[PDB]
Design a protein around this ligand. Structure first.
Ligand SMILES: [Mg+2]
Ligand SMILES: [Mg+2]
Lengths: 439, 439
């Protein structure tokens, strides 16, 4: 006979604003306010403004503000037509909310309003709805995901050493990452990661090398080869008291598009040797024998589907093979990859697809096919820690959200801490069995 | 005849946990829950575990966790004795809440529980009380400070280039900062900061120098002298389209105690020249004639009070002289400095004193003497942005919260943006006139 305020979940006000990301570039933040008084606030990390296969964030291109990277247009979209089309809709109907935005932008790649406008409102909606339902976001997400009460704390792959285009060094591989698979909780995992990271700083200082950090919070020291990169990591893991293999495994992102040139893969820091697809695969395979590298991301160019079919054949039974640039969080590409035996894992970048509902759909397609889904950060992040709730609420099982420095990264580890505290063993931390290719 | 929930401001529960700061080290986070349903959550930045003049945070020293820097004991103090002494107290009585934690800790320097446990609770409490009072934190802080509805947006001093002990280079000065005094809003100031910061990266790339960032998000390139550090700042400012002097002024931190040996200041990147106090003060004077440096922090050693009395006589009319190490946010030391004409400004580190009530008293003592208070970050920060609300609610007029990268820094900038959105001209951005020594 009385209606609680929780039931007044119609949207009455949406606000957008230009805030700053962790590289100092603008991004969009939205607030969704419901009739009952509930508020959700979320921000989109940085994305791509150009590209033929993914959703595009909208940038102003005004040279007199932020070197052309203002997001006043995306923000005006949130404040004007997005808001106007969502006022009076039920925030609890996440899929209806996202559909209205998707249909109103009217393009395939969200370029009218920007994936940045649309994601920010999608997630702020979701938080506002969570609040109206009387529940934390990870619980709402699990409900929206069709998996109520089903949770896991994800195994993190933590950036530690950078190379390629992300460093002045002679390391070809773009990043090396550690995964604390022997931890029994995410809180333990985070601590092991921190300990290794601090021991690596000591290793690097003793070699006369720089310990300043890149975008993701890891080190980009002047290492002489791929081998020296892996050696300093092994040395730091041992100095922290852990055992490579059993406690900590390695993951990499080759970004192999960056060294692809005339159908060959060319590695500056191995004498400028050229490799065919296949020879590059054998090169990577040789690294997996010397070091317990269990996950390899973008190990060939996004166009090299014949080569990815080969690599997946050779390495796929024992090694997680993660499509980042391969799939760009695009389910039409993932679908076809699945049908053709291409990779066995996908990096999920929610602003590359641009709405919460579509993100859940991408994670589900992965999971139904036996692929793993790794929830990912971007280069430009914010304070916002929504990807932690996403990973728990979908039981994704893995996350890639940075080194253990910079609060753009660490706010996510902290949120995973707060989540596990509340959930305990209702969110098990499963360790190496999350990783495709293990048992 | 009906009592609203907001009147139910008694503390019913306090929760402490160990989370991770921006360098990967543990810190304390607290949540204060009130009877009416209000919750405030806050984290303490990293501080000192040792020292004889300041409040000390409490680290575990268990070498098997976080290289000895766990804060499980500080966390236990929150969950047990602090919680039990506060259940049933009125969170709106900030001074009383703080007084109970101080008296129960029972030491002069907060070493039993830790300044980390105390501050975290103190701020969580203030946020819970703000919610019970129906107001944002900046409004509540202003009421606690004795200055209801009086606000300003602070002029930021932004870390841009690091030297001394914070870099491998030949820059003796620990940091150079830019101040966008020409902006009319803190939103514009922030944008100017960004643009200068991005132009500086392009200048450093063209010179073949490293653009990876330190703790505060600025650069530590291998520059050969203090002159060169100042030249690349000048060049970046010009490439961004601003004018040194009018639009952007410079602030520095010598941390002169790092080169103070046998009563003399010994500067590596100046031939290794030795200087008396008096000569070092005339060396700084000359920099202030050659470049628009309007603020100098710790221009002499903390023990050199005769020196600081001389530097203040000479520079103090025209230059802001900021005590950091000199005062360590300790009102006993500040009062004595004020009586002896020592410096004209103070860096406020709220975790160095350890409570919100004493932080307000520090700022008041500075302002009543005509000193300026610059609200400060620490080297290990979190996502928490309370220092932004603090600066606005005390009308401090200046803030030192980092470069324009890393969300540990940029979260504060974002919060200043949200505050100025809501307040507009009720929070004037006063520019150059906030700075001690300007007309
Ligand atoms: Mg990649
Ligand atoms: Mg200093």
């Amino acid at each position: 006979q009385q209606m609680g305020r929780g039931s007044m979940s119609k949207i009455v006000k949406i606000i957008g604003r230009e805030i700053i990301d962790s590289r100092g570039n603008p991004t969009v933040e939205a607030e969704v306010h419901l009739e009952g008084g509930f508020v959700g606030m979320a921000a989109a990390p940085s994305g791509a403004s150009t590209g033929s296969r993914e959703a595009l964030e909208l940038r102003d291109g005004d040279k007199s503000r932020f070197l052309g990277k203002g997001v006043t247009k995306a923000v005006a979209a949130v404040n004007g037509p997005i808001a106007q089309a969502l006022i009076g809709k039920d925030a609890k109907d996440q899929a209806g909310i996202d559909k209205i935005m998707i249909d109103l932008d009217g393009t395939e790649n969200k370029s009218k309003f920007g994936a940045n406008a649309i994601l920010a409102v999608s997630l702020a909606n979701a938080k506002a709805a969570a609040a109206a339902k009387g529940m934390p976001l990870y619980e709402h997400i699990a409900e929206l995901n069709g998996t109520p009460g089903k949770y896991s704390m994800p195994v993190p792959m933590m950036n530690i050493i950078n190379g390629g285009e992300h460093a002045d060094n002679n390391v070809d591989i773009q990043e090396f990452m550690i995964q604390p698979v022997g931890a029994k909780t995410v809180k333990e995992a985070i601590r092991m990661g921190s300990e290794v990271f601090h021991h690596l700083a000591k290793v690097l200082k003793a070699k006369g090398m720089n310990t300043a950090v890149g975008d993701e919070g890891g080190y980009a020291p002047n290492l002489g080869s791929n081998a020296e990169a892996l050696a300093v990591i092994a040395e730091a893991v041992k100095a922290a008291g852990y055992e490579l293999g059993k406690d900590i495994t390695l993951a990499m992102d080759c970004a192999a598009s960056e060294f692809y040139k005339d159908g060959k893969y060319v590695l500056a820091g191995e004498g400028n040797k050229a490799f065919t697809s296949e020879e590059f695969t054998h090169f990577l395979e040789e690294l997996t024998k010397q070091y317990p590298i269990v996950s390899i991301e973008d190990g060939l160019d996004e166009s090299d589907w014949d080569g990815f079919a080969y690599q997946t054949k050779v390495l796929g039974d024992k090694i997680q093979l993660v499509g980042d640039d391969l799939f760009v969080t695009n389910t039409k590409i993932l679908k076809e990859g699945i049908e053709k035996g291409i990779a066995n894992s996908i990096l999920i970048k929610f602003n590359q697809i641009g709405s919460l509902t579509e993100t859940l759909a991408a994670i589900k397609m992965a999971k139904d096919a036996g692929y793993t889904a790794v929830i990912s950060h971007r280069s430009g992040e914010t304070e916002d820690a929504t990807i932690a709730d996403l990973a728990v609420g979908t039981a994704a099982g893995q996350i890639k959200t940075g080194s253990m420095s910079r609060s753009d990264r660490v706010a996510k580890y902290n949120q995973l801490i707060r989540i596990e505290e509340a959930l305990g063993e209702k969110a098990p931390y499963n360790g190496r069995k999350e990783i495709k290719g293990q048992a």
